[PDB]
Amino acid sequence: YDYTDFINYYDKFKVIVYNVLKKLPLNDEIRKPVIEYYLNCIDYNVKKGKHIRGKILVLISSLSSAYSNIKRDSIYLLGWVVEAIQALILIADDIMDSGKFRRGAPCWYIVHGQSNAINDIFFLKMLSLSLIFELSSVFGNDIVMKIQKIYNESIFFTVLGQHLDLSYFDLSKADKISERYFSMVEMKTSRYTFYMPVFFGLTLSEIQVSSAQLNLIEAILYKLGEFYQVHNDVSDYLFNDSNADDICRFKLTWPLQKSFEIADEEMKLKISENYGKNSSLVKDCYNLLKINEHYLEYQRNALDYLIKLVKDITDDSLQKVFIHLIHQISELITN
Amino acid sequence: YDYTDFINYYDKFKVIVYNVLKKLPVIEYYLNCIDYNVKKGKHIRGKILVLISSLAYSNIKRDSIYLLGWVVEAIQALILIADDIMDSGKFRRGAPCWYIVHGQSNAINDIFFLKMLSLSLIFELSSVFGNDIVMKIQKIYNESIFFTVLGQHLDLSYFDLSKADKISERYFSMVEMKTSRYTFYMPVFFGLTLSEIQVSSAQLNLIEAILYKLGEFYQVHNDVSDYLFNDSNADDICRFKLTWPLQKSFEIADEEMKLKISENYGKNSSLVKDCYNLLKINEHYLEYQRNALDYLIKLVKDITDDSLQKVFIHLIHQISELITNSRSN
Numbered sequence: 001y002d003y004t005d006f007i008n009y010y011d012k013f014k015v016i017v018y019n020v021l022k023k024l025p026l027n028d029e030i031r032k033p034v035i036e037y038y039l040n041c042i043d044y045n046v047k048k049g050k051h052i053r054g055k056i057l058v059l060i061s062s063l064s065s066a067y068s069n070i071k072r073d074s075i076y077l078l079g080w081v082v083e084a085i086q087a088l089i090l091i092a093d094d095i096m097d098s099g100k101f102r103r104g105a106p107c108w109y110i111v112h113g114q115s116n117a118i119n120d121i122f123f124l125k126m127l128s129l130s131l132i133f134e135l136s137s138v139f140g141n142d143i144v145m146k147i148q149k150i151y152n153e154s155i156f157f158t159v160l161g162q163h164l165d166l167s168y169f170d171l172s173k174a175d176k177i178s179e180r181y182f183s184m185v186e187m188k189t190s191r192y193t194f195y196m197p198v199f200f201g202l203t204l205s206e207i208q209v210s211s212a213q214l215n216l217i218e219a220i221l222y223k224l225g226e227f228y229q230v231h232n233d234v235s236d237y238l239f240n241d242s243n244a245d246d247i248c249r250f251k252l253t254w255p256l257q258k259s260f261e262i263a264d265e266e267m268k269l270k271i272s273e274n275y276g277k278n279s280s281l282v283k284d285c286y287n288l289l290k291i292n293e294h295y296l297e298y299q300r301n302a303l304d305y306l307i308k309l310v311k312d313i314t315d316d317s318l319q320k321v322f323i324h325l326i327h328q329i330s331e332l333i334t335n
Numbered sequence: 336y337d338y339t340d341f342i343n344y345y346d347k348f349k350v351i352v353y354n355v356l357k358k359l360p361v362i363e364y365y366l367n368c369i370d371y372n373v374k375k376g377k378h379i380r381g382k383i384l385v386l387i388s389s390l391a392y393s394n395i396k397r398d399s400i401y402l403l404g405w406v407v408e409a410i411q412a413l414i415l416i417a418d419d420i421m422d423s424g425k426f427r428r429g430a431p432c433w434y435i436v437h438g439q440s441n442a443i444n445d446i447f448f449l450k451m452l453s454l455s456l457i458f459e460l461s462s463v464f465g466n467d468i469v470m471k472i473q474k475i476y477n478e479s480i481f482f483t484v485l486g487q488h489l490d491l492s493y494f495d496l497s498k499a500d501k502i503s504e505r506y507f508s509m510v511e512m513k514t515s516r517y518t519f520y521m522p523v524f525f526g527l528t529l530s531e532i533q534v535s536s537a538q539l540n541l542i543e544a545i546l547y548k549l550g551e552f553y554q555v556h557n558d559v560s561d562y563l564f565n566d567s568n569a570d571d572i573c574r575f576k577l578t579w580p581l582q583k584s585f586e587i588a589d590e591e592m593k594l595k596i597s598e599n600y601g602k603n604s605s606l607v608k609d610c611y612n613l614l615k616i617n618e619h620y621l622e623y624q625r626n627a628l629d630y631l632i633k634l635v636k637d638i639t640d641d642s643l644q645k646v647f648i649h650l651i652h653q654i655s656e657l658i659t660n661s662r663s664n
């Protein structure tokens with residue numbers, strides 16, 4: 001789709017941004033490249049990262065209830081709010097995971113120190129919170145309250161998911177591993193990534209009134225969800241050769257859980273051991289059973305399943321939005 | 336005061352968090368996070384929420400209030416765990432900082448826990464007071480932590496000693512933002528809201544003028560305690576922080592001491608402190624803290640409502656007692 005226009009709204013978002021930082025009263029503005037620090041921050045973090053999720057809200061927003069003026073902009077804004085929200089999440093993430101890189105540029109916690117990273121996170125959170133309260137002018141009180149409730153659930157869930165991700169207690173005799181993993185992925189990834197933006201979408205959209213069987217869309221966003229997380233995990237096993245990444249950590253991953261549904265007593269002693277220590281050797285075992293083989297299997301049932309539940313949408317017009325959605329996601333994973 | 340039983344509602348406050356946690360080990364993780372971080376300490380800021388909220392005794396939004404109080408206790412704890420990382424805190428409230436018992440990745444993550452939680456429990460007050468109140472509660476919170484963060488940025492963003500014509504102005508400006516206003520404006524302003532009191536808005540900026548100096552006076556002491564007792568490189572000076580003492584010493588030092596500070600600032604805090612004592616800076620807090628109180632009292636004495644200068648008399652009493660009955664001899 002076009003989508004160039006959302007992306008052009010940025011500059012009114014920094015207007016709308018900069019036009020908050022009138023925070024102190026009675027001076028000639030000297031103490032006040034604080035306002036310059038955080039515009040910088042925004043260009044760096046919010047101004048990179050594909051803007052996948054903000055797209056999804058603006059996408060979903062433009063079909064369920066086509067717009068034509070003057071709320072159109074309240075949507076772009078939130079879509080950049082989404083992006084600002086996502087960004088703060090992965091600033092946090094890159095810290096916890098000692099990451100190096102993101103959105104092309106190195107990690108913010110790297111450049112501006114970790115102590116500043118932590119402050120800027122909740123800066124971005126607090127601007128998002130207060131920016132969401134702008135809508136009330138354009139969209140009315142209850143439609144912003146439903147937007148709140150959605151912000152809260154998704155960011156909270158992400159926080160419990162991110163907690164499982166951190167949890168030091170992955171064990172040897174683990175046969176629920178597949179269920180630890182996937183249902184964490186639902187929390188730490190699918191909520192903010194797909195649930196939040198899509199469900200944002202049709203608050204602003206406010207149409208149509210689809211209910212009851214509307215657990216269907218939350219069943220697609222779930223799978224899109226782990227579709228993503230499960231692609232991001234593979235690309236890590238496939239595509240980084242550093243002297244410490246993922247399985248260096250005790251990182252509950254897709255190639256590790258289904259190497260635990262195929263491997264033997266002998267293999268599962270392989271993983272257990274040099275996990276956290278020897279990623280190459282663990283990566284080797286991964287090769288042996290060719291992780292990206294079955295990975296290529298996941299993908300087609302994972303698209304098959306999305307496909308068939310696509311053609312079960314009550315909204316012929318929202319049927320195709322998700323088919324659009326499912327399409328770019330795949331492509332985006334296929335790059 | 337009591338107060339008993341805002342503290343005793345902590346139980347009922349826990350139950351409401353556990354029920355937020357029907358998602359569905361993590362539960363027992365985060366229930367202990369809150370006991371570890373929220374249950375522990377003086378609870379001064381949630382104490383303030385009720386006090387102000389005290390003198391419409393008509394509904395059982397008296398639980399509701401309490402939970403808010405404990406929501407306010409959560410916000411300070413999740414502020415402060417942030418702080419202890421950024422500052423290399425060792426101990427807070429007599430106990431190992433959270434990022435220490437639970438490392439940085441979790442302390443960072445759990446900050447997000449304490450704060451979404453804050454957000455959710457607030458969101459569910461719509462029933463008890465209804466839409467307009469919550470909406471307004473929602474907007475103190477946003478300013479309060481928003482300014483706190485800017486305030487925390489400034490604490491991180493180091494000053495220019497060389498150009499210290501008025502670092503004091505930075506100091507007090509930073510101070511009002513990183514402290515005053517999640518400590519004082521937010522608690523006080525939540526409680527002014529739940530109450531819905533009659534309402535002397537014109538007479539607002541006065542009590543607003545009070546919170547400014549409740550706040551100032553709060554930090555100013557903290558900064559001096561650190562100066563007075565903290566013995567390490569993990570300290571104010573070694574960490575190169577902008578603080579009442581060094582701010583004053585620049586107001587109070589000849590061109591000798593002041594050049595001799597900005598060199599050991601902040602490597603050999605021993606030497607930085609040596610000066611203060613021969614600036615006798617602890618002399619200068621006391622005449623501060625001395626003038627702090629009456630100016631709060633003058634200030635307090637001008638509150639019109641007369642049922643709202645009451646609790647603002649207890650408020651002023653509480654903090655000064657708090658700030659004065661520390662390590663004395």
Ligand SMILES: O=P(O)(O)C(O)(Cn1ccnc1)P(=O)(O)O
Nearest residue numbers: 093097099162188189229232233
């Ligand atoms: O694998 P992670 O969960 O750390 C990641 O996917 C980020 N993330 C964090 C929460 N959900 C996803 P990324 O590989 O982008 O660093």
Ligand SMILES: O=P(O)(O)C(O)(Cn1ccnc1)P(=O)(O)O
Nearest residue numbers: 418419422513514554557558561
């Ligand atoms: O000295 P800080 O301002 O960092 C402090 O007073 C905490 N704080 C943080 C913001 N306002 C106050 P603490 O000495 O308790 O670590």
Ligand SMILES: [Mg+2]
Nearest residue numbers: 093094097099
């Ligand atoms: Mg990561």
Ligand SMILES: [Mg+2]
Nearest residue numbers: 093096097165
């Ligand atoms: Mg991660």
Ligand SMILES: [Mg+2]
Nearest residue numbers: 232233236246
């Ligand atoms: Mg990853």
Ligand SMILES: [Mg+2]
Nearest residue numbers: 418419422424
């Ligand atoms: Mg500190």
Ligand SMILES: [Mg+2]
Nearest residue numbers: 418421422490
């Ligand atoms: Mg500090």
Ligand SMILES: [Mg+2]
Nearest residue numbers: 557558559561
């Ligand atoms: Mg201090």
